[PDB]
Design a protein around this nucleic acid. Structure first.
Lengths: 7, 107, 93, 79, 94, 93, 107, 95, 80, 7
DNA sequence: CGGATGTATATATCTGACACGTGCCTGGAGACTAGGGAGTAATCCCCTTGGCGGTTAAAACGCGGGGGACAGCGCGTACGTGCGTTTAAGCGGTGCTAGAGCTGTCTACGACCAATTGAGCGGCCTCGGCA
DNA sequence: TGCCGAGGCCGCTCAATTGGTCGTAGACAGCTCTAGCACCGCTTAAACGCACGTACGCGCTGTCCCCCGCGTTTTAACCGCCAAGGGGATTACTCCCTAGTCTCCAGGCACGTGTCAGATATATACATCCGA
């Protein structure tokens, strides 16, 4: 799935 | 004339680049609008939406639920520090508050 | 005929959480959020262009408006996302 | 018409409990009523001004939203 | 029977977990119409307009009470007071 | 060339207090004040025109923006001044 | 051409109407600008300016001075109740504060 | 001769609430401004009026904060200001 | 440039407090005041430098400072 | 002399 | 009461900033045409207001008791006042060049217009997430 | 144990896309000169360090009175159902008001100058505080 590098 | 390809798929996005361009052109912001501005704006809006939705879905799963509700949106926003800074003066309807009791009042 | 962002918000939601729904009230709140952010950024870009005696709003104004309005790490990852989309859109003309 | 007395003492107590308050003095209710009256008058004046500029007879949720936003109190979920 | 404070803590926990409105709708609507009477006669209202007004008012009052609690704790008290409310409003700028 | 409101501010001062002067720092402050109020009123009028799907800014929008911005007694007298000036201008063509 | 008559003289004002019209037209506020809007705006600006200058002159005279300075402007604004509301988030350079000592600190 | 504690303090309050000059030294403030700015961009020049604008803003902000802190101190039946008063004032203001 | 925050001395903070109407000060106030001032200054200067960089300049100007201050609801009169 | 009727 | 210590008072005086006058040039006023934005007029139907009956959740009230607010007292330490000593801020000249501001050419980019058609909205239908 | 709202399926209109033309905004290069940086020497004003004492935070105790928890009776909020019309919203049509051009011309801006309001000191009369 689409994830975030900020988290 | 060739096959019509949308600018959203051309830039690899999900948000409507053409609609963003029309709003920028009609919003009384400046005399002229450049070609890359709608692409940049759509990319930024999509990124922010994705962040908020990921956190809200995490809260919904933590509540053992399938559907996202305003309570989950509020919990995610108020628990993320940067998002809390950004949406500092915004009220979310039917959102509630974070559970918090001062230590002095505890028995 | 009223237009909104509901379908695009739903597409992003399906990308992020493949098995998860959203209620209509939460969708309305997301609509309000998107409109609010759009207005903030566009106003900042307009002020910048007027300050520098320009008559055009380009991607440089949008990038500077994002740096002024978003805090900390949110601005860093947003600037990277916007730059990637512009260079990908230009390659395919 | 004396409708401010419809904001009863238990309702103020519920609001204070949601606010995290543990003990409430007996003079707080009148003060709360006054503060609420001031806030409501401030919002409703602007809402009515917007309605009048549109040449309308009905106050709308978008009027209320604009009036709230004018005072730095943005509200999500009503359009 | 319980000691004074136990039921209050339980009520705090109960009301910090839900999202429903805490004021009665009909009295609030009556008050809203009464106030609007002074600015224009024969005014109609939308249900969503009244609901938006109520949500805004409740959020505002809850925030004020959470500031008043800090002001009361600063003076080494547990009970909130009109002086605490006045100090919170003065510092906020209202 | 740098335009400013200095001569008009000086004329108003001459007709309010005849034997009174003003220094350059105070004149700069008054220039800032005039610019700030102009921006506030024009922005409110632009928002009002947008909200009603109108294309032009008229004196009806300026009057409504004054009623939203100025405090109680200031707004009542400002509206009287603006209405009187437009009537005198209209009965001059 | 029957001689030029100033638009400010037609309205009985001291503030410039043509310059206000140009600023409204060039400021990206709307597509079109009506004919009475600059007159209305100039009248409002002139009224507010006169209101401030009268109080500043009174303060300067109380100070036994001939010329108005930022201290006089600040005293006038902070002592007028409605002007203080209008300009409540503004800092005036070299203005100072109002003399005020809390009653409990006095001997 | 020796005045009692508080008399000179009240005289100083009366003196400094009357004037309008800046209360911080210009060269140290300028050094501080340049040191802070060197972290965002290197080899930066400053106009003369920019530093003065920064100093005026800083001094106004601090004076207002002290005004709020004094009320916070008086609320607790005290005369001395303490760090917790500043913390409470900033928390209520929203900083 | 290093350790320039100590140039904001104790008598200067005392003068600011005196203009603020304060009569008594504890000894731990000065460190807190220095920290608060540093935070505020960093916040203003970051935005001013952003404005300067967008215009492709090497000199920060009074207009840049004024715009940065106005962006945070702290409008300043008397510098243009 | 010009005077304000509000005052 | 009386003395030492800051307050405001009235002398003079000198300087630099404010107020005024001039030349010119660019922006405002006058006159004319053209097109579409907005002002009326008229009709449809959505939704706001008003009323009635029942049921039961919430409010109002009185009572008893304990725990928290408030006043009083004692103590020790930390902050204010004043003096002697050290430091570096402020001022006045001088030099140098980095860079902000201005001017002229000339292309690449964006507004505008016509012709197609696929994306997005409105209306229905069903079942499973949620109370 | 359901019941109703979220999601998925068609019809269709309109707004986004493709292609071509024109004119001007802005990118680049070259030149001027102002102002921002750096340094040096002198005064003296302010920062610094120290000592003494007093007054004010702060803890501890005691009294009382006023909020809280609880049981009982009264009230009106809420919910469902019904009816009637004020007014919000849309469509058609016409005219008059604003934009866009082209002449003129004077109002405002840059610049220079010459006095007077108001900063500086000095001597003085007078409140003011504090310990007798």
């Amino acid at each position: 799935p689409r994830r975030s590098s900020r988290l | 004339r060739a096959k019509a390809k949308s600018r959203s798929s051309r830039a690899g996005l999900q948000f409507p680049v053409g609609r963003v361009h029309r709003l920028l052109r009609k919003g009384n912001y400046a005399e002229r609008v450049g070609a890359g501005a709608p692409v940049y704006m759509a990319a930024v809006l999509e990124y922010l939406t994705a962040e908020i939705l990921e956190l809200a879905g995490n809260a919904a799963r933590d509540n053992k639920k399938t559907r996202i509700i305003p309570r989950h949106l509020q919990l995610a926003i108020r628990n993320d520090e940067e998002l809390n800074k950004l949406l500092g003066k915004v009220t979310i309807a039917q959102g509630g508050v974070l559970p918090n009791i001062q230590a002095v009042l505890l028995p | 005929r009223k237009e909104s962002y509901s379908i695009y918000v739903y597409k992003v939601l399906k990308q992020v959480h493949p098995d998860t729904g959203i209620s209509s009230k939460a969708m309305g709140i997301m609509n309000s959020f998107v409109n609010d952010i759009f207005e903030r950024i566009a106003g900042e870009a307009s002020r910048l262009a007027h300050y520098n005696k320009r008559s055009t709003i380009t991607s440089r104004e949008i990038q500077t408006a994002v740096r002024l309005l978003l805090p900390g790490e949110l601005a860093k990852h947003a600037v990277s996302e916007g730059t990637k989309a512009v260079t990908k859109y230009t390659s395919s003309k | 018409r004396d409708n401010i007395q419809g904001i009863t003492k238990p309702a103020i107590r519920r609001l204070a409990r949601r606010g995290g308050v543990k003990r409430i003095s007996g003079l707080i209710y009148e003060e709360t009523r006054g503060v609420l009256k001031v806030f409501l008058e401030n919002v409703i004046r602007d809402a009515v001004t917007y309605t009048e500029h549109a040449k309308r007879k009905t106050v709308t949720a978008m009027d209320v939203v604009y009036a709230l936003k004018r005072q730095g109190r943005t509200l999500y979920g009503f359009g | 029977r319980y000691r004074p404070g136990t039921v209050a803590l339980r009520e705090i926990r109960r009301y910090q977990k839900s999202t429903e409105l805490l004021i009665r709708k009909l009295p609030f609507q009556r008050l809203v119409r009464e106030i609007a009477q002074d600015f224009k006669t024969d005014l109609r209202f939308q249900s969503s307009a009244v609901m938006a007004l109520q949500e805004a008012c409740e959020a505002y009052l809850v925030g004020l009470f959470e500031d008043t609690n800090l002001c009361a704790i600063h003076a080494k008290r547990v009970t909130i007071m009109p002086k605490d409310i006045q100090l919170a409003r003065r510092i906020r700028g209202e």
